[PDB]
Amino acid sequence: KQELSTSRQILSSYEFLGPEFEGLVQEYTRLKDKIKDNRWMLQELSKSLP
Amino acid sequence: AAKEKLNSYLDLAPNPSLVKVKIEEAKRELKATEVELTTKVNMMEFVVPEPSKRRLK
């Protein structure tokens, strides 16, 4: 009950920066996820050179 | 449910202008990793004769 109360207090400070910020955060998050996927794909092709 | 919603916000300074810069940096990094992935794919072609259709060594 104490941990839930602290986390809910911090989230309330970011939610105050508007929908536009949330859009940016969503975009950033999407891009980081694609970079992570491409790096992961390059690593898997090198192990296969027999 | 409340902690998971907080970890998505931490790499981003609460400043929109600075976030746009981080987004542009992430777009450059995505183009470089895509070129490296295409080159390694082409060298793929020549090596010749011979052995069946088949073989070990």
Nearest Cα residue to B14 out of A38, A7, A25: A25
Neighbours of B19 (CB within 10 A): 19
d(CA A39, CA B18): 25
Q: Please identify among residues 7-36 of chain B the ones whose CB lies closer than 8 Å to any CB of chain A.
A: 8-9, 11-12, 14, 16, 19-20, 22-23, 26-27, 29-30, 33-34, 36
Considering only CA atoms, give the Rg of chain B: 23
The number of C-alpha atoms within 13 Å of A43 and in the hemisphere containing its C-beta is 6
Inter-helix orientation angle B16-42/A19-46, to 10°: 20
Resolution in units of Å: 33.0
Cα separation values, B53 from A2, B6, B48, Å: 70, 58, 12
Structure-solving method: cryo-EM
In angstroms, what separates the C-alpha of A20 from chain B's closest C-alpha? 8
Structure tokens at A3: 């941990």
Structure tokens at A23: 């859009």
Burial environment of residue A44 by CB neighbours within 10 A (0 to 12, 13 to 18, 19 or more): exposed
d(CA B3, CA A43): 31
d(CA B46, CA B49): 10
Q: Which residue matches tokens 């794909």? A: A41
